[PDB]
Amino acid sequence: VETFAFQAEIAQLMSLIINTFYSNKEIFLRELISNSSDALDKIRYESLTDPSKLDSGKELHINLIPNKQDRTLTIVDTGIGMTKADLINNLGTIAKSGTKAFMEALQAGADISMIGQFGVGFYSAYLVAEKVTVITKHNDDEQYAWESSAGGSFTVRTDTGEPMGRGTKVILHLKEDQTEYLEERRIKEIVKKHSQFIGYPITLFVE
Numbered sequence: 001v002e003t004f005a006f007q008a009e010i011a012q013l014m015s016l017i018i019n020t021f022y023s024n025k026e027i028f029l030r031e032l033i034s035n036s037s038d039a040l041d042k043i044r045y046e047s048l049t050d051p052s053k054l055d056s057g058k059e060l061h062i063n064l065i066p067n068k069q070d071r072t073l074t075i076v077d078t079g080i081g082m083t084k085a086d087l088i089n090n091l092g093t094i095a096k097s098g099t100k101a102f103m104e105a106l107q108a109g110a111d112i113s114m115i116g117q118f119g120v121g122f123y124s125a126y127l128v129a130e131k132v133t134v135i136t137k138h139n140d141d142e143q144y145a146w147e148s149s150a151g152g153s154f155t156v157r158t159d160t161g162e163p164m165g166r167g168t169k170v171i172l173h174l175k176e177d178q179t180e181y182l183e184e185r186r187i188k189e190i191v192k193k194h195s196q197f198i199g200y201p202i203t204l205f206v207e
């Protein structure tokens with residue numbers, strides 16, 4: 001297991017998301033589903049020129065899987081997946097400018113629900129999760145687990161869990177007072193409200 005420090009500005013953003021009083025937390029799900037959709041768009045586009053990229057799985061879709069026993073909500077997709085370099089370097093570097101702009105916008109009167117307009121919607125996960133685990137598999141690479149409970153650091157390791165084929169699984173370890181997002185009717189409500197026209201099947205598992 002390798003442990004890394006967040007860039008200072010990203011650590012600052014995560015603390016802001018964790019510490020700021022803001023009741024409209026449900027928007028986290030839209031941001032994560034949007035990121036899944038983008039990843040599915042990507043593998044779909046690449047396969048138009050290289051069909052063999054779907055050898056790792058042809059079905060393009062999103063599963064939402066609540067687990068009250070583990071207190072997790074998992075978002076699973078069969079998109080393009082992420083490389084080790086994505087998890088350690090690339091996505092963090094890209095996030096620097098959007099993080100800066102978002103925090104400046106909040107100072108000028110924007111609210112947290114606008115976070116996706118700055119390309120850093122992922123971090124809204126920490127509105128509801130004490131820990132986020134991301135398992136991912138890209139065609140050109142091994143299966144990895146990225147994880148962070150904030151506090152300035154994250155880890156990356158090779159994942160030895162069930163093989164995924166291709167795609168990304170975001171496991172939200174929910175805060176004790178955010179278990180409403182494990183309820184079928186609540187998740188259904190949020191998907192209909194904010195993610196109504198996503199161009200891939202979204203299957204909400206029940207327990």
Ligand SMILES: N#Cc1ccc(N2CCN(CCCCc3c[nH]c4cc(O)c(C#N)cc34)CC2)cc1
Binds near residue numbers: 079154167170
């Ligand atoms: N400094 C720094 C720094 C160093 C690393 C990170 N992480 C780099 C990995 N990220 C993993 C989540 C990426 C965002 C995401 C949410 N739902 C998805 C669904 C998907 O299908 C794909 C794909 N493909 C992507 C996502 C976390 C942040 C941050 C900051």
